Amino acid sequence: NVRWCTISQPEWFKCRRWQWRMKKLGAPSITCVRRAFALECIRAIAEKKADAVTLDGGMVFEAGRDPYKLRPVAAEIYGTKESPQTHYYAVAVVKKGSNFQLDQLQGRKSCHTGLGRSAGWIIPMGILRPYLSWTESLEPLQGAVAKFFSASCVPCIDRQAYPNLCQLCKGEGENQCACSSREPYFGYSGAFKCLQDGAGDVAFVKETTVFENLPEKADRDQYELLCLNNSRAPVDAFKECHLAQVPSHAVVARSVDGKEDLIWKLLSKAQEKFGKNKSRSFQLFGSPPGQRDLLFKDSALGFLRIPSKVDSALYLGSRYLTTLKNLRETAEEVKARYTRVVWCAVGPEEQKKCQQWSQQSGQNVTCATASTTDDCIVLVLKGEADALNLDGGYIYTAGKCGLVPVLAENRKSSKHSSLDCVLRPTEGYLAVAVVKKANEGLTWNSLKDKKSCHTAVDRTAGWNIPMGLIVNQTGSCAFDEFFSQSCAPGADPKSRLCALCAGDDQGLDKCVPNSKEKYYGYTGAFRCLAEDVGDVAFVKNDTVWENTNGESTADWAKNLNREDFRLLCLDGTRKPVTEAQSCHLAVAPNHAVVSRSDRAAHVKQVLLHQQALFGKNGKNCPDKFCLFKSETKNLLFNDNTECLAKLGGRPTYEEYLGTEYVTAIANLKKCSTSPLLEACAFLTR
Numbered sequence: 001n002v003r004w005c006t007i008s009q010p011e012w013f014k015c016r017r018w019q020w021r022m023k024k025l026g027a028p029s030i031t032c033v034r035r036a037f038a039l040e041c042i043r044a045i046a047e048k049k050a051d052a053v054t055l056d057g058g059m060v061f062e063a064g065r066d067p068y069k070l071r072p073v074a075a076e077i078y079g080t081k082e083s084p085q086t087h088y089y090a091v092a093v094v095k096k097g098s099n100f101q102l103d104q105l106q107g108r109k110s111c112h113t114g115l116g117r118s119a120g121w122i123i124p125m126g127i128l129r130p131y132l133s134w135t136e137s138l139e140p141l142q143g144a145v146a147k148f149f150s151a152s153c154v155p156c157i158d159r160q161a162y163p164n165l166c167q168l169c170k171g172e173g174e175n176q177c178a179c180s181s182r183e184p185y186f187g188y189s190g191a192f193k194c195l196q197d198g199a200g201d202v203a204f205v206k207e208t209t210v211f212e213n214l215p216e217k218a219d220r221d222q223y224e225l226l227c228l229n230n231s232r233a234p235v236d237a238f239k240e241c242h243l244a245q246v247p248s249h250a251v252v253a254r255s256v257d258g259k260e261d262l263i264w265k266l267l268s269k270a271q272e273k274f275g276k277n278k279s280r281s282f283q284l285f286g287s288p289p290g291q292r293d294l295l296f297k298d299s300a301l302g303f304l305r306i307p308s309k310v311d312s313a314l315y316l317g318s319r320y321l322t323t324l325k326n327l328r329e330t331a332e333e334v335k336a337r338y339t340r341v342v343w344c345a346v347g348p349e350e351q352k353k354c355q356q357w358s359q360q361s362g363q364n365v366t367c368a369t370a371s372t373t374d375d376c377i378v379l380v381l382k383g384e385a386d387a388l389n390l391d392g393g394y395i396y397t398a399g400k401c402g403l404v405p406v407l408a409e410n411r412k413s414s415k416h417s418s419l420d421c422v423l424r425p426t427e428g429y430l431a432v433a434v435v436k437k438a439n440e441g442l443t444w445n446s447l448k449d450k451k452s453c454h455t456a457v458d459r460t461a462g463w464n465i466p467m468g469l470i471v472n473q474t475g476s477c478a479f480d481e482f483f484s485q486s487c488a489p490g491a492d493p494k495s496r497l498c499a500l501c502a503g504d505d506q507g508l509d510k511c512v513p514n515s516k517e518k519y520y521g522y523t524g525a526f527r528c529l530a531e532d533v534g535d536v537a538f539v540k541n542d543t544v545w546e547n548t549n550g551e552s553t554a555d556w557a558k559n560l561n562r563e564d565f566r567l568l569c570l571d572g573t574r575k576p577v578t579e580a581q582s583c584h585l586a587v588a589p590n591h592a593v594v595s596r597s598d599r600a601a602h603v604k605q606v607l608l609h610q611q612a613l614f615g616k617n618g619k620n621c622p623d624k625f626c627l628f629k630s631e632t633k634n635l636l637f638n639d640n641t642e643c644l645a646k647l648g649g650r651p652t653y654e655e656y657l658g659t660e661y662v663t664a665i666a667n668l669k670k671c672s673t674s675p676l677l678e679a680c681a682f683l684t685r
């Protein structure tokens, strides 16, 4: 049983018509909950009084927020049968023979589909905003818009407060300018009817609205499209004369106990039975004259199922998310947001370092925190954060979600002193497998059923290199059953890969992938080996050196003689820590700062500026703040980092990491699926 939320009597009548029509096809059953508007349904679903409803992108946004916390489980697909699309275009339709252009809309009368709707509100108001003369302190956007156009019809608007924005609305009193089918001028088709009846000079609807209302070209010849360059165009030239491409309408459900399986089941069979061109009796994507788009959009081809990790912000995307959120902020807030760089911190300790950086940077750098690196990637994707420095295996994940490399970590080399660190090339680190010397008979061959220590899952040295090699050599994909017990932060806490993880000093958050887990990272995985919790540690060369022989002042690593450890070589021999060059697993590319394509240049410029103040030969280091020092913790950047080096021209994730490593990651990735990887797949549609 799925409870569908309807916001009107004509929508309720279709649901009920769909409910009876379902029964004979066998499960699931559909219930028709009656509400008045979109937010009521949002609240109904959140309160478990209903299960599904289809919203427009502006509503999708609001439904994802607290305290609703709803996610889009399926999206409507538009377009043709052979040429589908899962987005649409917001356009401005004018009647042919008008002298106004897009700039000349002040003092005109307009038609809108709804307040806070994609094509009808959000999209057109982000374009008109310079013409608005909005002084944000005196009134809201609705107040600036009210004095911009003369009369109008924008349903859902406060009729009592902005009567001119409801003045052109064709509704009957105290139901006129309503947020549903009650107002005849509501919706895309209702907006077109407002233009067609000559009430408004322009209607803001989608690209197919004029095609669905005027079947013959002769009547369609009397309309035009206002383009962005302040020109005009014919209605079939929408793909060149639109305002923005907006993501399609999605069905939403609860994040927890959402009934998404039943919802999809029901949606799949309905679309297969009464879809577009499927039956004579019932049309799912077909609704009555005078009341279009009931439940779903009219002439929608079907439903595209959305991946579990994709939320409402991810579904909508940073581009739409910017424009929506930018309308909510002021010009100066918007200005300041683009200027500031928001760094993403993984964990508690990193956040503290970032906050110190922020205050020392005079709020030039701002922080955001996530508990994992993956969460931070997601925040970068959402636009909530701007950047973070990442290990190569995470860079793969970020690049597959479209983030690009900006600057790489560059430490002290053996050759140059000449060429500046910024202009000096990265050398790459050596991936090693370290053991205690006192456990003789431990070779690379005798590795099965031993205890292991990894920096984290998906990382280069602690994960991708040894597990990729082991999978290849075993010829199996069950890495969970290779070692007897491990500590690989990022695995299932109830699995055996988390079995040796410590948690904090209270022992909570065991196997978490951040600095609060005792055995996390380069430092923690060595510590795991050093304290004899595991038999092998997969880390880099530098870690062994930095944590032995008086280098580390930490009490666990303070009494460590470097001659008590060996390096397992891939030829079955052991070697001392001085011959890492002849005994390593692979060479890994250095950790780099990733960012979004449009933020990359700004982030780069800013990071160069910050490096001069707080870096290795920083002006404020070491008396004020040192960006690369974290008390051997490697918070934000590795403590050994000499500077952040510039990369070459255009490099993608594949170019930075390298074909061989990318393919190596690729083959290892076939053994297990990542939800985030599935979600980024869908976002790069």
Ligand SMILES: *[C@@H]1O[C@H](CO)[C@@H](O[C@@H]2O[C@H](CO)[C@@H](O[C@@H]3O[C@H](CO[C@H]4O[C@H](CO[C@H]5O[C@H](CO)[C@@H](O)[C@H](O)[C@@H]5O)[C@@H](O)[C@H](O[C@H]5O[C@H](CO)[C@@H](O)[C@H](O)[C@@H]5O)[C@@H]4O)[C@@H](O)[C@H](O)[C@@H]3O)[C@H](O)[C@H]2NC(C)=O)[C@H](O)[C@H]1NC(C)=O
Pocket: 412, 413, 414, 430, 541, 542, 543, 545, 546, 549, 550, 551, 552, 580, 581
């Ligand atoms: C595997 O990783 C190794 C570590 O990353 C790497 O060895 C490093 O190699 C680089 C260049 O290749 C060396 O850089 C050179 O450093 C010298 C100056 O070094 C001296 O001072 C540093 C810093 O000392 C201070 O800071 C530390 C820690 O913050 C404090 O403990 C210390 O008290 C100081 O306050 C120090 O690290 C060096 O110590 C090393 O060498 C001495 C003997 O010389 C040893 O007794 C000691 O245990 C340690 O091994 C040294 O005192 C500089 O003048 C040169 O121009 C150059 O920049 C690094 O020092 C070296 N690091 C270490 C820890 O050895 C290996 O190259 C790498 N292997 C491969 C195959 O890649």
Ligand SMILES: *[C@@H]1O[C@H](CO)[C@@H](O[C@@H]2O[C@H](CO)[C@@H](O[C@@H]3O[C@H](CO)[C@@H](O)[C@H](O)[C@@H]3O)[C@H](O)[C@H]2NC(C)=O)[C@H](O)[C@H]1NC(C)=O
Pocket: 464, 465, 468, 469, 472, 659, 660, 661, 663, 664, 667
């Ligand atoms: C684990 O095994 C897999 C499968 O053998 C390894 O992937 C293989 O990697 C090699 C080199 O990285 C690929 O070969 C290359 O092919 C190209 C184009 O044909 C050629 O120009 C290169 O010179 C090279 O020969 C090979 O295609 C690839 N195999 C598959 C099935 O993708 C993987 O690297 C191994 N893992 C680790 C950690 O070494």
Ligand SMILES: *[C@@H]1O[C@H](CO)[C@@H](O)[C@H](O)[C@H]1NC(C)=O
Pocket: 360, 361, 362, 364, 609, 610, 613
């Ligand atoms: C912040 O950036 C501005 C502009 O580049 C610069 O003048 C200022 O000194 C910076 N402050 C810090 C501490 O980075």
Ligand SMILES: [Fe+3]
Pocket: 056, 057, 117, 118, 119, 249
């Ligand atoms: Fe819409």
Ligand SMILES: [Fe+3]
Pocket: 391, 392, 459, 460, 461, 588, 591
């Ligand atoms: Fe690494």
